[PDB]
């Protein structure tokens, strides 16, 4: 969810 929060 690092990349989920960062990208979306």
């Amino acid at each position, epitope marked *: 969810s690092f990349i989920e929060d960062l990208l*979306f």
Partner: single-chain antibody
Amino acid sequence: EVQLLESGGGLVQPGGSLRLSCAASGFTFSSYAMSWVRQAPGKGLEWVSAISRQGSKTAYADSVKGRFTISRDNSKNTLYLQMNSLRAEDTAVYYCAKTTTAFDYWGQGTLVTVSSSTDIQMTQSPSSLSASVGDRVTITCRASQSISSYLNWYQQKPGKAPKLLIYQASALQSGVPSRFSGSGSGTDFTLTISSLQPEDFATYYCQQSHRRPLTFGQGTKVEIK
């Protein structure tokens, strides 16, 4: 055994369309977000698109907004890029990349030739350099605003896809030699090669994963004399 196999590129007239595919093997495809990154000839890396693990969320760079569509099929372990309304500015090698806090693994890249800000700016210095075997090489990367410690370093051989070298400023990717070190936080970062080797010639890119959109430096080409 991790593999990303791209196909579908080629030559196209302005205004036409192409569909890229990336075939993934060697990891659980549905467990990871996936991106497309492109590189115009003799130019730098530019993030294009990204999609969540299930396909439910997508993101697009402003440059391709409205024209490009990313999708995935987890039952075939395949990532897609539908490119419509193609412009000559879209001319680039396109890579698919497994996306975590960095781009962990890149496909080999497919060429697409089209012929007939509030963003964080990454700047590297120097833009190239030549040094001898055994030399200590230092490269700098500055962000126009703070990126905490989310700074990634990629190594690109001529003609090859980028490989992830260091992520989160100082963490080494598996199998990277200890001669590579990174440091820095906030806005100023450094990559160091303690003892330069002949196989180290490449262009080195930094890239921040602090705030969308993900942005690259313009690269540092390093030659061994």
